């Protein structure tokens, strides 16, 4: 599913994300933006062999397992595939994990490369929410 800014930001809200570990939905529709372009099914494979998955491009390292990808851990406890369904419940949870794993959302790359520091209010702007 791609995702309109909107509608992902109010799914975001609906699923506690506006502020989890201090992070305003600004920042988190702007790392959704940069990591997937709002589509739930993008991967991307990492030089170390592990996949980055879903709308926060989680990877199979340590969070999910894809079932190629030595050493995983699976700390989310589900398989990559849920991280690409339509409905983003499996994404949020497991972002809820990365976000407390003591860096914040510098977990992610693109949003430490491309919002943090920016305007991220900007992202829900003339949203419904």
């Not at 609906?14 to 990591?35: I, P, Q, T």
């Not at 372009?37 to 996949?51: I, V, Y």
């Amino acid at each position: 599913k791609v995702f309109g800014r909107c509608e992902l930001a109010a799914a975001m809200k609906r699923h506690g994300l506006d502020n989890y570990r201090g992070y305003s939905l600004g920042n988190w529709v702007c790392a959704a933006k940069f990591e997937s372009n709002f589509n739930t099914q993008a991967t991307n494979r990492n030089t170390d062999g592990s996949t980055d998955y879903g709308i926060l491009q989680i990877n199979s390292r340590w969070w999910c397992n894809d079932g190629r990808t030595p050493g995983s851990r699976n700390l989310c406890n589900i398989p990559c595939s849920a991280l690409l369904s339509s409905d983003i419940t499996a994404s949020v949870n497991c972002a809820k994990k990365i976000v407390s794993d003591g860096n914040g959302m510098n977990a992610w790359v693109a949003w430490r490369n491309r919002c943090k520091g920016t305007d991220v209010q900007a992202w829900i702007r003339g949203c419904r929410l």
